[PDB]
């Protein structure tokens, strides 16, 4: 359910950018009238795909990843401990000699 | 929409009504044994939407109505909500004469069409007066619960909901007569002077497979708010509070051990799953956007 | 690369010995290979394992053990002196040069990390080379400060799959 | 915009009047992309003759930058302050198009100015005309650009941008594929666990055994 929303959003963005790519391919082919404004708007759009590739952003991203990894570790440990408790409870009745 | 199932899904059996099971559970009457029996109220999307729309349409006045459904195990299912022709002031509602005729006629007409559910509760809107049971709602809910046992009081606030952007629905049930049993005082304050007389319930919502399928194509411009979602940033306080309550639950379970560990593990798993989902979305965004033209 | 292959070869030779008592050259090669990987515990235990007759058979084992004793004391000038003081057999020759290169790299790394200001004489003793040669070399490299005060200053200037596995396990 | 009136009024003129109108356009504030003007037949045929310098100046304004202008300072005719300011602003736009974090030293080198105050004033006045948006920073001596206008493009470079767009599309597709794989695997895991649960079902069979004993 979490990944379906991301898949749909990426699909719609990909469809829009595919339409833009088809239009610019047609314009460069010469089968459609040449628009000097839409082409320059496309150039402005296409000169900014690497959005915010600074080192500070990379450090922040790694910090966030490490924090979420710690939050996953503390949260898998408790589940393992709960399974531990259930197993020991079962062993202390069905195997313990009263 | 492909590479999955399209027939009756696993979220449609909640909409199915079994007459024999309901008759058996009504004859069993497991509520009278343990009085802290009901703790969960599952409301359909349609019922919640109708309740909110009717509460807001009343303006500054108060409105009231009924809600149908059933009860299974430890949960109360509320499926549909139909309004009432009440004329109430800014504070109190009466439902004097035409409300009861409307109740009977509407229930009969719904049963004519195919509505197989019975009345499960009543709701009344506080126009900007919070979400709590007043001294009159407590009395009328006790009156209803004494004889028509499966019941629940739903309180909705239209003005606060429209001003803050979040629905405020509260499900409550009243204790019988003589049933006594830096931290904020809101736990006692936000309820009336009868705070010890009634107890709240956990409210959850559900929808059908066709409901979700049709609501998926409801609007095609929230994709921008999904790509630039900025998760793990708008709910950091929520995660910190969840961690605090999880630590308290862990302490309580440790004290007990020296079945409570199950709910603590569930809460920890929920919080960790939310955090991991946020990180997954961030990784997807980074792969999509910043990994191009390098 | 070749060192790991030689280690595997000699371990295989020692593990299965139809004759039981291996040749002194084999044991000397094993001792030298243990010395190369700066793993002193295994080298010492291998040296202790050796029957005395094979120790007395050849002096190459004695020289390698002297090298090991000197390197156990962390006496770098002694290591450099004893790595060239004597002569050894042909099969161990292509490994002592590698050992000297490894110990030179280790000394350089230790000087770079554990010292901010070091006396040039101490640096020369650590590398086992004349002071001027080292000075010229580290001038070209650039990790050195000045003369006169005799103080060289060594400075050192599928995530989706894993996440989905974690959340799948957590959900039970 | 404003170039529409200029091209409309210069459609029916040719000769020295064409060069005068070109100079007026290059001196006109608020005009930064001279794309439609270069498509006129008069400007194209202006190449042959003794006035090719004006066409070269127009091409330099449309595509070239300040270092290109200073390369042929003698060849091109003299320019006033407005032309130089527009050329410097277009050079800043071209620099910001490539990198979104422009160092001060690079700007000083390309724009050929000494004082840091002059460079900061030029950047501020370029920000005022809304061609670029960004913030200067003196602690690290760098200018951060959040948005810049799209400068003029030549006819043969269009395929270039097309390629880049294609790349982006490909990346999106890849991501989608990966997501699908992931979810499939997740579902498999779930079903496998359910299988184990059904094994617990076999347990009640053993219960039937204790019915016999």
Curated annotation (Swiss-Prot), chain A:
Q: In which tissues is it expressed?
A: Widely expressed.
User: Where does the record place it?
Assistant: Nucleus; Cytoplasm; Cytoplasm, Perinuclear region
Annotated region (Interaction with Vpr) at: 1-98
| Job of this protein | Component of the COP9 signalosome complex (CSN), a complex involved in various cellular and developmental processes. The CSN complex is an essential regulator of the ubiquitin (Ubl) conjugation pathway by mediating the deneddylation of the cullin subunits of SCF-type E3 ligase complexes, leading to decrease the Ubl ligase activity of SCF-type complexes such as SCF, CSA or DDB2. The complex is also involved in phosphorylation of p53/TP53, c-jun/JUN, IkappaBalpha/NFKBIA, ITPK1 and IRF8, possibly via its association with CK2 and PKD kinases.
**Quaternary context:** Component of the CSN complex, composed of COPS1/GPS1, COPS2, COPS3, COPS4, COPS5, COPS6, COPS7 (COPS7A or COPS7B), COPS8 and COPS9 isoform 1. In the complex, it probably interacts directly with COPS2, COPS4, COPS5, COPS7 (COPS7A or COPS7B) and COPS9 isoform 1. Interacts with the translation initiation factor EIF3S6. Interacts weakly with RBX1. Directly interacts with COP1 and 14-3-3 protein sigma/SFN. Interacts with ERCC6.
Family assignment from sequence similarity: Belongs to the peptidase M67A family. CSN6 subfamily.
Q: What is this protein called?
A: COP9 signalosome complex subunit 6
Q: Could you tell me which species this protein originates from?
A: Homo sapiens
Q: Which residues of the full protein are shown?
A: 219 to 316 of 327
From Swiss-Prot, chain B:
**Compartments in which it is found:** Cytoplasm, Cytosol; Nucleus; Cytoplasm, Perinuclear region; Cytoplasmic vesicle, Secretory vesicle, Synaptic vesicle
Keywords attached to this entry: Acetylation, Cytoplasm, Cytoplasmic vesicle, Hydrolase, Metal-binding, Metalloprotease, Nucleus, Protease, Signalosome, Synapse, Zinc
SUPFAM superfamilies linked to this entry: JAB1/MPN domain (SSF102712)
Q: Which GO terms describe its cellular component?
A: chromatin; COP9 signalosome; cytoplasm; cytosol; eukaryotic translation initiation factor 3 complex; nucleoplasm; nucleus; perinuclear region of cytoplasm
The keyword Hydrolase appears for this protein = yes
Q: Which domain of life is it from?
A: Eukaryota
Q: What is its EC number?
A: 3.4.-.-
Binding residues for Zn(2+): 124, 126, 137
Tell me if Zinc is a UniProt keyword of this record.
Answer: yes
Q: Which GO terms describe its molecular function?
A: deNEDDylase activity; enzyme binding; macrophage migration inhibitory factor binding; metal ion binding; metal-dependent deubiquitinase activity; metallopeptidase activity; transcription coactivator activity; translation initiation factor activity
One GO term under biological process is: translation
What are its cofactors?
a divalent metal cation
Domain (MPN) ranges: 41-178
Cross-referenced SMART domains, in alphabetical order?
Answer: JAB_MPN
Pfam families in UniProt: CSN5_C, JAB
* Bilayer-spanning residue ranges: none
**Motif interval(s): JAMM motif:** 124-137
Q: What class of enzyme is it?
A: hydrolase
InterPro entries, per database record:
CSN5_C, JAMM/MPN+_dom, JAMM_MPN+_peptidase_M67A, MPN
Family from the record: Belongs to the peptidase M67A family. CSN5 subfamily.
The note filed under miscellaneous reads: The CSN complex is associated with some 'Lys-63'-specific deubiquitination. Such activity is however not mediated by the core CSN complex but by the BRCC3/BRCC36 component of the BRISC complex.
Identification of the protein by name = COP9 signalosome complex subunit 5
From Swiss-Prot, chain C:
Query: Which residues belong to any copy of the PCI domain?
Result: 1-157
BP GO terms, sorted: activation of NF-kappaB-inducing kinase activity; COP9 signalosome assembly; negative regulation of cell population proliferation; protein deneddylation; protein neddylation; protein phosphorylation; regulation of protein neddylation
Q: Does the keyword Cytoplasm apply?
A: yes
Q: Which PROSITE patterns match?
A: PCI
Q: Where in the cell is it found?
A: Cytoplasm; Nucleus
**What GO CC annotations are associated with the protein?**
COP9 signalosome; cytoplasm; cytosol; extracellular exosome; nucleoplasm; nucleus; perinuclear region of cytoplasm
Listed InterPro entries: COP9_CSN8, CSN8_PSD8_EIF3K, PCI_dom
What are the UniProt keywords, alphabetically?
Cytoplasm, Nucleus, Phosphoprotein, Signalosome
Task: Family membership, please give it.
Answer: Belongs to the CSN8 family.
Tell me, in a sentence or two, what this protein's role is.
Component of the COP9 signalosome complex (CSN), a complex involved in various cellular and developmental processes. The CSN complex is an essential regulator of the ubiquitin (Ubl) conjugation pathway by mediating the deneddylation of the cullin subunits of SCF-type E3 ligase complexes, leading to decrease the Ubl ligase activity of SCF-type complexes such as SCF, CSA or DDB2. The complex is also involved in phosphorylation of p53/TP53, c-jun/JUN, IkappaBalpha/NFKBIA, ITPK1 and IRF8/ICSBP, possibly via its association with CK2 and PKD kinases.
Q: What is this protein called?
A: COP9 signalosome complex subunit 8
Q: Which organism is it from?
A: Homo sapiens (Human)
Gene symbol of the encoding locus: COPS8
UniProtKB/Swiss-Prot annotation, chain D:
* Key words of the record: Acetylation, Coiled coil, Cytoplasm, Host-virus interaction, Nucleus, Phosphoprotein, Signalosome
Where's the PCI domain? Answer: 1-150
Q: Does the keyword Phosphoprotein apply?
A: yes
- Biological-process GO terms, alphabetical: COP9 signalosome assembly; protein deneddylation; regulation of protein neddylation
Q: What GO cellular-component annotations does this UniProt entry give? A: COP9 signalosome; cytoplasm; cytosol; nucleoplasm; nucleus
Q: Can you tell me which residues the record assigns to a coiled coil?
A: 179-213
Tell me the subunit arrangement. Component of the CSN complex, composed of COPS1/GPS1, COPS2, COPS3, COPS4, COPS5, COPS6, COPS7 (COPS7A or COPS7B), COPS8 and COPS9 isoform 1. In the complex, it probably interacts directly with COPS1, COPS2, COPS4, COPS5, COPS6 and COPS8. Interacts with EIF3S6. (Microbial infection) Interacts with vaccinia virus protein C9L.
User: Per the similarity annotation, which family is this?
Assistant: Belongs to the CSN7/EIF3M family. CSN7 subfamily.
Please state what the protein is called: COP9 signalosome complex subunit 7b
Q: What is the lineage of its organism?
A: Eukaryota, Metazoa, Chordata, Craniata, Vertebrata
Per the record, the gene is: COPS7B
Q: Which region of the full protein is contained in this chain?
A: 10 to 222 of 264
């Amino acid at each position: 359910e979490h990944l379906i929303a991301q898949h749909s959003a990426i699909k719609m963005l990909h469809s829009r950018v595919k339409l833009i790519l088809e239009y610019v391919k047609a314009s460069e082919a010469g089968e459609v009238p040449f628009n000097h404004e839409i082409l320059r708007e496309a150039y402005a759009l296409c000169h900014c795909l690497p959005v915010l590739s600074t080192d500070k952003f990379k450090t922040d991203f790694y910090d966030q990843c490490n924090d979420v990894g710690l939050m996953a570790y503390l949260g898998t440990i408790t589940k393992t401990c709960n399974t531990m408790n259930q197993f020991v409870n079962k062993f202390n009745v069905l195997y313990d000699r009263q | 929409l492909a590479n999955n199932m399209q027939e009756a899904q696993s979220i449609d059996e909640i909409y199915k009504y079994d007459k024999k099971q309901q008759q058996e559970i009504l004859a069993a009457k497991p509520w009278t044994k343990d009085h802290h029996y009901f703790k969960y109220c599952k409301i359909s999307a349609l019922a919640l939407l109708k309740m909110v729309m009717h509460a807001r349409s009343g303006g500054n006045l108060a409105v009231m109505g009924l809600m149908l459904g059933k009860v299974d195990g430890e949960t109360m299912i509320i499926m549909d909500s139909f309004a009432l022709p009440v004329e109430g002031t800014e504070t109190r509602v009466n439902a004097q004469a035409a409300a009861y005729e409307y109740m009977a006629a509407y229930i009969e007409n719904a049963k004519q069409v195919g509505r197989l559910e019975n009345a499960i509760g009543w709701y009344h809107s506080h126009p900007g007066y919070g979400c709590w049971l007043s001294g009159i709602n407590v009395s009328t809910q006790m009156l209803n619960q004494q004889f028509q046992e499966p019941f629940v009081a739903v309180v909705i606030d239209p003005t606060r909901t429209i001003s803050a952007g979040k629905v405020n629905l509260g499900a409550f049930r009243t204790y019988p007569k003589g049933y006594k049993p830096t931290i904020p005082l809101n736990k006692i304050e936000d309820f009336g002077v009868h705070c010890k007389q009634y107890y709240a319930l956990e409210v959850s919502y559900f929808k059908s497979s066709l409901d979700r399928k049709l609501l998926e194509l409801l609007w095609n411009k929230y994709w921008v708010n999904t790509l630039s979602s900025s998760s793990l940033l708008t709910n950091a306080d929520y995660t910190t509070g969840q961690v605090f309550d999880l630590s308290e639950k862990l302490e309580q379970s440790e004290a007990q051990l020296g079945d409570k560990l199950a709910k603590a593990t569930r809460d920890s798993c929920k919080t960790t799953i939310e955090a991991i989902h946020g990180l997954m979305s961030q990784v997807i965004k980074d792969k999509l956007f910043n990994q191009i033209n390098i | 690369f070749s060192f790991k292959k030689l280690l595997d070869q000699c371990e295989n030779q020692e593990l299965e010995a139809p004759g039981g008592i291996a040749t002194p050259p084999v044991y000397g090669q094993l001792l030298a290979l243990y010395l190369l990987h700066n793993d002193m515990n295994n080298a010492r235990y291998l040296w202790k394992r050796i029957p005395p007759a094979i120790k007395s058979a050849n002096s190459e084992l004695g020289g390698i053990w002297s090298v090991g004793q000197r390197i156990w004391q962390r006496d770098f000038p002694g290591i450099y002196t004893t790595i060239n003081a004597h002569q050894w057999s042909e099969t161990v020759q292509p490994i002592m040069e590698a050992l000297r290169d490894a110990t030179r790299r280790r000394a350089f790394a230790l000087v770079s990390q554990a010292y901010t200001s070091i006396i040039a004489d101490d640096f020369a003793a650590f590398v086992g080379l004349p002071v001027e040669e080292a000075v010229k070399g580290i001038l070209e490299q650039g990790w050195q400060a000045d003369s006169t005060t005799r103080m060289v200053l060594p400075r050192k200037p599928q995530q989706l799959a894993r996440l989905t596995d974690y959340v799948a396990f957590l959900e039970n | 915009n404003l170039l529409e009136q200029f091209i409309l009024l210069a459609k029916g003129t040719s000769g020295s009047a064409l060069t005068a109108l070109i100079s007026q356009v290059l001196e006109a504030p608020g005009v930064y992309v001279f794309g439609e003007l270069l498509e006129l037949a008069n400007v194209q045929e202006l190449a042959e003759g003794a006035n090719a310098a004006y066409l070269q100046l127009l091409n330099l304004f449309a595509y070239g930058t300040y270092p290109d202008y200073i390369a042929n300072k003698e060849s091109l005719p003299e320019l006033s302050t407005a032309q130089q300011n527009k050329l410097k602003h277009l050079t800043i736009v071209s620099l910001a198009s490539r990198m979104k974090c422009i160092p001060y030293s690079v700007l000083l080198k390309d724009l050929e100015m000494r004082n840091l105050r002059e460079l900061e004033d030029l950047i501020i006045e370029a920000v005022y005309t809304d061609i670029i948006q960004g913030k200067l920073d003196q602690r690290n001596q760098l200018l951060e650009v959040d948005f810049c206008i799209g400068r003029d493009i030549r006819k043969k470079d269009i395929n270039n941008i097309v390629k880049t767009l294609h790349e982006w599309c490909d990346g999106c597709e890849a991501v989608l594929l990966g997501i699908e794989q992931q979810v499939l695997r997740a579902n498999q895991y779930k079903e496998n666990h359910n299988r184990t649960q059904q094994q617990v079902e076999a347990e009640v069979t053993n219960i039937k055994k204790t019915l016999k004993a």
